[PDB]
Symmetry: C3
């Protein structure tokens, strides 16, 4: 299942249009390259519209949102949707920051294939993980989307079924962008064949499995190269 | 006192609003996470004004300054000040590039809790090697009621009168981008912690040099980085 | 191989100050590579600051990997002030041919006389305006070099470098280099540095390609893309 997703990512080499935050660009691109996918960060509004039609999948991560970037993200989402390409939302700090929250609420109309966030963010988007489970189900139902609430245990739901994924290591939280990079791999996984819910759960399992390996060294510095090595 | 600062960073886990440059974002966030703090990069002018009142501390680093970002940074600083949250200035290349030099002069009016810079930067800001910039650092510290850290082979930290110096580190630290910029973020975090601000800032300097001495044992700047982050992390 | 070893010492000796206007994905790595080789990176992006600094720096890099309109303005100001001050500037036309805005922008920049251009086969073909790994674009390269009096480097598993008449080839490296982001973008930076060194420009740009291939070959035996990065920077630093 994780093994299957791994083989699939390599065989399809999904081309992922990443519109993500300033802190995680490099790490996201290297995670995607390590699993055999192709990252591409295109942020000018016109280029983004052009490219989102071409890419296999689109990721929207609002971690360092600005108004200019929001314009280009909205154009990207519209062109992806028009072209039948699945897009993934990562609502970083929604619920904590007003503008972000308003923007993501507006993007929900545009029918993401998947939403990947923490409990607080999922709870905010819907209006501890366990507490977010009802909200995630409701979101998945309203939008016919797959919702992943990530944490020490990840929970993935299509609004009917719910899958839990345990493993990994707390050290992953002391490394920036592991969640942001998980969303990119989830975004890629949505362009792959199979049950979407199950592919998103496998993506969570893939990242946890790499993380458990990488965490063995014991430190967050050495974690990064080992994490990337484990993905490849 | 380095051991004490490490303990404090872990126990207080300060939330640090980082408005820093494009070259050192990731490293800054990983450094803060490694010492037990929580980074947050928020750059829209509205969100930044919102967030700067919530975070425990604010870092302003002008290394890749742009017009939009300057507006956002000023707003963040104004709201941090109004909320009582300490903000730190890192005046990267102030004195060499005009726009950011003027901008930083403006910002000094809003009373940073700390300023962390190299000798030339501190001289340009004061209106006057690290030790050569020491009378300027002291003048700047007195004028603003701030702590000034003039950094280099040896770091000097002053509140206007008291001068603490911090030796250690390794020249390899200068062949890795962002070690100085990451120091500013740890200094920023430390200004939010209990205790004497001067001693905490000197302690932040000691912490980063000790980690750097350890990481430099790996021989090269590539291996330096993982080792440096490992050395900052406990357990 | 000799000019590569030579370049390695010249970069360290001159410590060229490179003004880097490059993409959001490769900032850190570009800076660290330039530091590892003994150069000095500087990322300056405000229009007024970039104009000021482009006059001062030893060389300028323009990489359009994550182009925006605001940034293209600053990049133009930089290029113009670098040219006025006689500092060599280098073009990395990332994804030219695949995205229209940056293709038009880079065509606009060609008029401003870059000292070097470095791209892959498809980018160089599209930049030259020719249809139909790197060998295939060598005609386009040559053509482009002549028209502009530039040095063009077309990279791939084998790199070709030309001033329009002469052609130098460099092989080696390792395909793992492609599973790590920014290795091309970083090569561009070192090329940009190399254009500011004394000697034959063409030969120096080729040697830059060689330097990076050699380090990549050593870095690649740490058989994963994660371990590659520290090993690559260490390799560039060693000696
Ligand atoms: C630290 C940080 N600030 C905005 S985004 C981000 C990375 C986590 O998504
Ligand atoms: C290399 C560089 N250029 C602007 S900022 C920065 C990071 C070093 O402080
Ligand atoms: C992944 C990516 N997207 C725009 S630029 C860039 C850098 C490739 O090296
Ligand atoms: Mg999130
Ligand atoms: Mg500084
Ligand atoms: Mg290129």
């Amino acid at each position: 299942p994780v093994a299957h997703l791994r083989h699939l990512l390599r065989a399809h080499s999904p081309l992922v249009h990443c519109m993500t935050n300033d802190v995680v660009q490099t790490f996201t691109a290297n995670v995607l390259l390590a699993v055999g996918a192709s990252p591409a960060m295109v942020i000018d509004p016109r280029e983004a519209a052009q490219f989102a039609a071409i890419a296999d999948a689109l990721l929207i991560n609002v971690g360092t949102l600005t108004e200019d970037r929001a314009v280009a993200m909205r154009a990207a989402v519209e062109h992806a949707r028009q072209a039948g390409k699945p897009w993934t939302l990562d609502p970083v700090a929604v619920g904590a920051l007003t503008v972000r929250t308003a923007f993501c609420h507006e993007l929900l109309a545009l029918q993401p294939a998947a939403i990947r966030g923490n409990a607080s963010e999922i709870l905010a988007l819907a209006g501890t993980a366990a507490a977010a489970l009802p909200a995630a189900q409701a979101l998945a139902r309203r939008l016919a989307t797959v919702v992943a609430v990530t944490g020490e245990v990840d929970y993935v739901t299509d609004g009917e079924r719910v899958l839990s994924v345990a493993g990994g290591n707390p050290l992953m939280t002391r490394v920036v962008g592991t969640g942001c990079a998980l969303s990119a791999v989830v975004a890629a996984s949505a362009a792959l064949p199979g049950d979407r819910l199950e592919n998103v759960a496998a993506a969570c399992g893939l990242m946890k499995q790499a993380g458990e390996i990488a965490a063995r060294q014991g430190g967050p510095g050495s974690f990064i190269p080992a994490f990337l090595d484990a993905l490849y």
